[PDB]
Amino acid sequence: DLHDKSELTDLALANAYGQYNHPFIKENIKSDEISGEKDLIFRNQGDSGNDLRVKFATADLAQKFKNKNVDIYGASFYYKCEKISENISECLYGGTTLNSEKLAQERVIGANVWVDGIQKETELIRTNKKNVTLQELDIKIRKILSDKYKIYYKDSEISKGLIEFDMKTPRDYSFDIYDLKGENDYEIDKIYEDNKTLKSDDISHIDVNLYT
């Protein structure tokens, strides 16, 4: 039972359309500043000079990355992002991996895609990270699905969709693309606050099934 796009508000759709098409990506930056037990602050490193607040589910996660060089890839937002200082604060959940943890060669993952059961062109996503967040993978697939199938347009035909990430062992992860937790990003993106990370070389493939 997949959620229908009709259940979403115009604001939820517009927010999803914006964030999945414009991921926040930063390579090799470092915060030695914890805020509110569970957040790391990167001053001046958000978009357009803004400060970045990266939010984690736990103090242990924030502490793991404190004073480490990291790469960030995640969905960013402003509304309800807790103020840091005088500069504008931009936020993101998780999306964080150690910059030193890199593969010997790029991993390219293929996604088989179907719309009403009809097979569409394979989609390809890639990473050089030894450990990659599930958030990054999800965003890279939703970006292509948005580009090609307009999944977050209000009037486009797609009304249901599931993305499944399968490992080389019997373990998978999945996202129902219309099961948004709220209409604002600060709530929607909490699905990434666990900073869930997968070993890139243990990922097998991705399945995308969309329906009208």
Side-chain angles (χ1 to χ4, degrees), residues 1-82 84-212:
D1 178 25
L2 292 175
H3 288 262
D4 203 281
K5 181 169 75 189
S6 63
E7 296 166 27
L8 300 176
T9 64
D10 263 5
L11 175 62
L13 258 9
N15 276 324
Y17 171 70
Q19 68 162 26
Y20 286 115
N21 276 294
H22 300 104
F24 180 82
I25 302 169
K26 271 276 154 140
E27 197 80 356
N28 195 202
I29 57 168
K30 172 162 54 186
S31 167
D32 178 33
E33 184 175 1
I34 291 281
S35 173
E37 292 208 2
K38 297 191 273 75
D39 301 352
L40 280 172
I41 303 304
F42 301 75
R43 290 165 183 268
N44 309 308
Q45 310 185 100
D47 298 314
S48 301
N50 299 332
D51 287 349
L52 177 73
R53 172 184 292 279
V54 178
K55 303 174 72 61
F56 299 95
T58 66
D60 286 342
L61 284 163
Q63 290 296 328
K64 176 154 77 177
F65 297 110
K66 185 187 185 179
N67 206 31
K68 302 278 188 273
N69 297 309
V70 299
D71 296 326
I72 304 304
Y73 192 116
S76 54
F77 58 94
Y78 294 94
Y79 175 65
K80 302 264 268 272
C81 180
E82 296 90 348
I84 292 173
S85 193
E86 296 185 21
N87 194 32
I88 299 249
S89 190
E90 181 176 17
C91 274
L92 161 159
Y93 290 100
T96 297
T97 51
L98 292 171
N99 175 260
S100 64
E101 300 274 43
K102 289 289 146 60
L103 297 166
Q105 69 162 156
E106 198 79 355
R107 174 64 203 274
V108 178
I109 303 165
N112 64 99
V113 179
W114 305 77
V115 176
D116 290 331
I118 300 309
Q119 190 166 9
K120 309 294 290 182
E121 186 175 300
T122 311
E123 295 181 0
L124 304 168
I125 61 167
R126 305 181 182 73
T127 186
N128 60 14
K129 298 176 165 90
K130 184 179 321 274
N131 301 300
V132 67
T133 60
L134 179 57
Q135 177 176 16
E136 168 171 349
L137 304 178
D138 186 23
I139 286 164
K140 287 192 178 185
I141 295 291
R142 299 200 205 197
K143 184 166 188 292
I144 297 172
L145 302 181
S146 170
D147 289 343
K148 299 187 72 169
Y149 306 118
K150 304 183 178 177
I151 49 164
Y152 292 120
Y153 275 43
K154 185 172 71 65
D155 296 339
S156 66
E157 62 172 11
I158 304 297
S159 67
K160 291 177 172 168
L162 181 70
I163 298 173
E164 172 175 332
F165 314 77
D166 298 329
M167 305 299 290
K168 291 180 173 175
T169 49
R171 176 164 51 203
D172 60 339
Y173 298 95
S174 65
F175 290 102
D176 167 332
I177 67 179
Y178 298 120
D179 185 20
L180 303 186
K181 170 140 41 196
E183 61 181 351
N184 302 294
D185 294 341
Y186 87 92
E187 293 289 0
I188 294 168
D189 298 329
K190 283 182 181 176
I191 55 175
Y192 305 130
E193 66 181 307
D194 63 4
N195 206 51
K196 174 67 167 177
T197 299
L198 304 179
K199 286 269 170 196
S200 297
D201 284 341
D202 290 350
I203 297 166
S204 169
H205 63 282
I206 292 162
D207 322 297
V208 180
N209 287 265
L210 310 183
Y211 308 89
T212 64

